[PDB]
C-alpha cells in the first residue's frame, strides 16, 4: 500500500529490516550508473554471499500487452542474453512487475536499483545513494570486508560536499546535456559539466582520490559516470568539449578504481552501450551502436605516484 | 535541356567555356567538404579576382511552397546570417532554383558546389573533383599563383591512387558510417574508415604530405574531411573509435594545411556545425549543437621536422 520505498536496513531493535544474510536481493542493470554503485559496494565490502543480485536485459522492451510502456525486462532463461538472468526469486518478467507486486499504490518510476526483501515480499529501498550507505555499515557482522569504511565520520562533511557539486555537474549533469531539447539549456549543462570535470582534474592532480588519500563513497559515485563517458556520454549525450581520455588525471584515476579487486566485475560495457543506444529511438532512431575507443582499463596507470 | 552538368573549362579552340576572368561564379556552402575543396583552390591558386563565390545558408530550409523539399537557400540580405550572401548574380533564393534556371531536364541532386557561367547563364560543372582540376590548370594566365601545381604529371599516378582509397574510406566513408541504418553496414564503414586513417597516420609519419614532400590535390581532399572530424563526424556520424586529436601526425598535419595562407579563410566551423546538426531532424531531432573541443588550428605544429 506504500507509495514510496525509502526504508532502511538497520541493526536496531524493532526494525522491519534487520541485516540478515540471504534475506535481501539486489535487482540491477549493468548499464545504469546508479545501479552500478550498488554492485561496486557488494564487491568492495564483500557482501556477495549475504546479498545476491540479478541483472535485467540492457535494451528496454514492452512490459505489458495492454499499454505500450517500455522499460526493464528479465530474460526468460539464463542463455537468452549474457550478463542477464531471469528473476528466479519471484518469477517476474519486468522491473515494473516487481513494483506492482510490492505495492499497487507505488507512484514513482519503475527504476533500478531495487533492494528486495524475500521475507515480507517487498521493496526495501530503490535509491542508490541510500542502498550503498546501508551496504557500508549495516552488514559488517557478515561482510567479508567489514573493516573497510567508505563513509567514515571524519570524511562525511567533505564527502557530502563533494557529492553535492559532483551530482549536479557530473553524475546527473551528463543527462541534462542529453535530455536538453533546447540549445540554451544544453549549453548550460555542458558548460557546468566541464567546470565540474576541470575541478575534479585539479583535485586528482594533488591527491589519489577525490576526497583525499583513501577511497571513499565519493569516488564510487564519480567512477560510474566516468567509466561511461567516452563510450556513451561523449556521443549519445553530446558531451564532447573534452573526452575523459584527454583528462590525464581522471583517466588514470578511472583505471585505478577499475583495477581495484572486484570492481571490473561491475563494468559491462556491452550492456552499457546496448542500453543507451538501443532503448531510445527518440535520440537514436536506428539504434546504431558506435564502435567506441575500446579502452583497456586494466592497462597500467600512474596513480601510485602519490 | 541538359540532364547533367559535367563540362570543363578549357584553353582550347572551339570551346564553350574559355577561362575568362569575371565570367564564372562559384556557389558553395562552407559546411560541405566537397564545396570546401573549391574554396581552398581559389585561395591557393590565387583566383579570387578571376572567380568570385557566394555561400548559401548552412541550415536547410524549404525551397518551395508547393512541395516540402528541404535544401540550400540563399539569405535575402547580406545581414541575415554571417558567412552567407544573397545571390546577387541571378537573384536566386535556393540552389534548386539555380539548377532549374539552367535546365528543366536536370536529373541529378540540387547540390553544391556549382560552377556557374554568367555568359550562357548556365551551370558549367557541379563535381568538386573536376572543378578543382580546371582551377589548377586552366586559369594560369590570370592566376595570382600560376606556378603552383597541385596535380603535377609526376604525381598523378600516386594522387589518383591515393584519392582512390581515401575517397572510399575517409571522404565518403564517414557518410557511410552516418547514413548506416543497420549495425553490420555501420561497422563495415567504421572499420574500413579507421583502416584508412591508420594508413594515413603511417604515411604522414614518414613525410610531410600524403603524396610526398610537397602539397598536392590529395592533401586538400583529405584535409576537408579531417577538419570536420572531431566536431561533426566523431559525434554526428558516430565515428568514435579514435578522434583526429588522438592521431598525432594527422592532427598536426591538419594544422599545417590549415595554416597555409588563405586556407583558414575556407574553414567556417559555425556553418559546418550548424548545417550537419541542424538540417537532419532524422538523425538529430532537436537539432542540438554539441559544444565541441573548439580546437585552435592556428596553434603550433611539428610538421616542419621534415
Ligand atoms: N534515484 C535513483 C535513480 C535510478 C535511475 O534513474 N535508474 C534508471 C536507469 S539509469 C532507470 O531504471 N530508469 C528507468 C525509467 O525511468 O524508465 C537512484 O539514484 O538510485
Ligand atoms: N559529387 C559532388 C558531391 C556534392 C555533395 O554531396 N554536396 C552536398 C553537400 S555536403 C549537397 O549539396 N547535398 C544536397 C542534397 O543532397 O540535398 C562533389 O563531389 O562535388
User: Do residues B175 and B35 share a domain?
Assistant: no
User: Do residues B202 and B132 share a domain?
Assistant: no
Instruction: Write down which residue in B259, B280, B296 finishes a domain.
Output: B259
Beta bridge partners, A61, equal: A71
Distance CA A303, CA A301 (A): 6
Best probe of the B interface among A194, A238, A278, A280, by most B CBs < 10 A, is A238
Strand order, beta sheet including B122-125: B52-55, B24-28, B114-117, B122-125
Angle at A200 between CA A194 and CA A205, to 5 degrees: 130
Max CA distance (Å), chain B: 59
Residue in the structure block whose three cell numbers are 583525499: A212
User: Do residues B141 and B274 share a domain?
Assistant: yes
Q: What are phi and psi of B114, to 5 degrees?
A: -140, 120
CA B35, distance to chain mean position in Å, is: 3
User: Do residues A132 and A155 share a domain?
Assistant: no
What residues does ligand 2 touch, defined as CB less than 6 Å away? B 32, 34, 71, 109-113, 127-129
Q: How was this structure determined?
A: X-ray
Any idea what the CATH number is for the domain that residue B8 is in? Answer: 3.40.30.10
Buried/exposed A154-176: b ≥16 CB within 10 Å, e otherwise = ebeeebeebbeebbebbbebbeb
Distance CA A116, CA A33 (A): 19
User: Do residues A121 and A153 share a domain?
Assistant: no
Any idea what the CATH number is for the domain that residue B170 is in? Answer: 1.20.1050.10
- Chain A positions touching B238 (Cβ under 8 A) are 235, 288, 290-291
Q: List, by residue number, the catalytic residues of B.
A: 32, 175
Name the residue among B45, B53, B65 with its Cα closest to residue B263.
B45
For residue B270, the surrounding DSSP H or E stretch is: helix B269-278
Q: What is the DSSP string of chain A?
A: --S--B----SSSS-S----TTTEEEEE-TT-HHHHHHHHHHHHTT-TTTSEEEE--SS-EE--SSS--EE-B--SSTTSSTT----TTT--SBHHHHHHHH-TT--S---S-EEEETTTTEEEE--HHHHHHHHHHTTTTT-TT-S--SS-HHHHHHHHHHHHHHIIIIITHHHHHHH--SHHHHHHHHHHHHHHHHHHHHHHHHSSBTTBSS--HHHHHHHHHHTTIIIIITTTT---SS-GGG-HHHHHHHHHHHTSTTTGGG--HHHHHHHHHHS-TTTSTT----------TTS--SGGG-
- Give how far Cα A188 sits from Cα of A176, A242, A271, B276, B290, Å: 9, 16, 29, 22, 12
Name the residue among B71, B61, B87, B85 with its Cα closest to residue B268.
B85
Residues of A with CB under 8 A from a CB of B: 180-183, 186-187, 190-191, 194, 230, 234-235, 238-243, 245-246, 282-283, 285-286, 288-294
Name the residue among A165, A171, A224, A177 with its Cα closest to residue A28.
A224
CA A31, distance to chain mean position in Å, is: 8
Residue in the structure block whose three cell numbers are 544544453: A186
Angle of helix A217-226 versus helix A153-166 axis, rounded to 10:
30
CB contact under 8 A, B288 and A240: no
User: Do residues B61 and B204 share a domain?
Assistant: no
User: Do residues A238 and A272 share a domain?
Assistant: no
Report the number of distinct structural domains present in chain B: 2
Q: Is residue A34 a contact partner of residue A113, using CB atoms and an 8 Å limit?
A: yes
CB contact under 8 A, A292 and B240: yes
Which residue in the set B245, B283, B290 is minimally distant from A238, CB to CB? B290
What is the β-pairing status of strands B24-28 and B52-55? Answer: parallel
| Nine-digit cell string for B196 | 584508412
User: Do residues A163 and A93 share a domain?
Assistant: no
What is the β-pairing status of strands A122-125 and A114-117? Answer: antiparallel
Is residue B261 classed as helix, strand or coil in its secondary structure? coil
Quote the minimal CA–CA distance from A89 to chain B in Å. 35
CA of B240 to the centre of ligand 1 (A): 27
Residues of B with CB under 8 A from a CB of A: 180-183, 186-187, 190-191, 194, 230, 234-235, 238-243, 245-246, 282-283, 285-286, 288-294
Q: What is the DSSP string of A206-223?
A: HSSBTTBSS--HHHHHHH
| Nine-digit cell string for A269 | 560495457
Name the residue among A122, A65, A64, A66 with its Cα closest to residue A94.
A64
User: Do residues B56 and B110 share a domain?
Assistant: yes
Task: Please list, in sequence order, all residues whose beta carbon lies within 8 angstroms of the beta carbon of residue B298, skipping any fewer than 6 positions away.
Answer: B255, B258, B259, B264
Name the residue among A290, A275, A156, A286 with its Cα closest to residue B233.
A290
Distance CA B35, CA A37 (A): 49
Radius of gyration of the CA atoms of chain B, in A: 19
User: Do residues A140 and A153 share a domain?
Assistant: no
Give the number of C-alpha atoms closer than 13 A to the C-alpha of residue A297, restricted to the C-beta side: 26
Within a 10 A sphere around the Cβ of A22, how many other Cβ atoms? 11
Segments forming the whole domain that contains residue A305: 1-148+260-306
Is residue B301 classed as helix, strand or coil in its secondary structure? coil
User: Do residues A126 and A165 share a domain?
Assistant: no
- Chain A positions touching B194 (Cβ under 8 A) are 291
Distance CA A77, CA A84 (A): 9
Name the residue among A61, A71, A144, A140 with its Cα closest to residue A112.
A71
Name the residue among B262, B8, B45 with its Cα closest to residue B142.
B45
Beta bridge partners, A55, equal: A28
- Chain A positions touching B190 (Cβ under 8 A) are 290-291
Which residue in the set A181, A190, A283 is minimally distant from B291, CB to CB? A190
Sign of the C-alpha dihedral computed for residues A155, A197, B278 and B79 taken in this order: positive
Alpha helix positions (H), B9-102: 33-44, 95-102
Is residue B79 classed as helix, strand or coil in its secondary structure? coil
Buried/exposed B223-237: b ≥16 CB within 10 Å, e otherwise = bbbbbbbbbbbbbbb
Q: What are phi and psi of B117, to 5 degrees?
A: -110, 120
Q: Does the active-site annotation cover A32?
A: yes
User: Do residues B17 and B100 share a domain?
Assistant: yes
Distance CA A1, CA A107 (A): 11
- Chain B positions touching A181 (Cβ under 8 A) are 286, 288
Beta bridge partners, A94, equal: A73
The experimental resolution of this structure, in angstroms, equals 2.5
CB contact under 8 A, A238 and B240: no
Nearest atom within ligand 1 for CA of residue A95: 12
Distance CA A197, CA A177 (A): 14
CA of A190 to the centre of ligand 1 (A): 21
Amino acid at each position: 500500500t506504500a507509495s514510496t520505498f525509502r526504508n532502511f536496513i538497520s541493526k536496531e531493535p524493532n526494525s522491519q529490516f534487520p541485516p540478515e544474510s540471504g534475506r535481501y536481493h539486489l535487482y540491477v542493470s549493468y548499464a545504469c550508473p546508479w545501479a552500478s554503485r550498488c554492485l561496486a559496494y557488494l564487491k568492495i565490502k564483500g557482501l556477495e554471499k549475504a546479498i545476491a543480485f540479478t541483472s535485467v536485459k540492457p535494451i528496454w522492451e514492452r512490459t505489458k500487452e495492454s499499454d505500450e510502456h517500455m522499460g526493464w525486462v528479465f530474460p526468460a532463461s539464463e542463455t537468452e542474453e549474457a550478463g542477464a538472468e531471469p528473476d528466479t526469486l519471484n518469477g517476474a518478467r519486468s522491473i515494473r512487475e516487481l513494483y506492482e507486486l510490492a505495492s499497487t499504490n507505488y507512484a514513482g518510476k519503475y527504476t533500478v536499483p531495487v533492494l528486495w526483501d524475500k521475507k515480507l515480499k517487498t521493496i526495501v529501498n530503490n535509491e542508490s545513494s541510500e542502498i550503498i550507505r546501508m551496504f557500508n555499515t549495516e552488514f559488517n557482522d557478515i561482510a567479508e570486508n567489514a573493516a573497510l569504511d567508505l563513509y567514515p565520520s571524519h570524511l562525511q562533511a567533505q564527502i557530502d560536499e563533494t557529492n553535492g557539486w559532483v551530482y549536479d555537474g557530473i553524475n546527473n549533469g551528463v543527462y541534462k546535456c542529453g535530455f536538453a531539447r533546447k540549445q540554451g539549456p544544453y549549453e548550460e549543462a555542458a558548460i557546468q559539466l566541464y567546470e565540474a570535470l576541470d575541478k575534479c582534474e585539479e583535485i586528482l592532480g594533488r591527491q589519489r582520490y577525490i576526497c583525499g588519500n583513501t577511497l571513499s563513497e565519493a569516488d564510487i559515485k564519480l567512477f560510474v559516470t566516468l567509466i561511461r563517458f567516452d563510450e556513451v556520454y561523449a556521443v549519445h549525450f553530446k558531451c564532447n568539449k573534452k573526452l575523459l581520455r584527454d583528462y590525464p588525471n581522471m583517466f588514470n584515476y578511472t583505471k585505478d578504481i577499475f583495477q581495484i579487486p572486484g570492481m571490473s566485475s561491475t563494468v559491462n560495457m556491452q550492456h552499457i552501450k546496448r542500453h543507451y543506444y538501443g532503448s531510445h529511438p527518440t535520440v537514436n532512431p536506428f539504434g546504431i551502436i558506435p564502435l567506441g575507443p575500446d579502452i583497456d582499463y586494466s592497462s597500467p596507470h600512474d596513480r601510485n605516484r602519490f
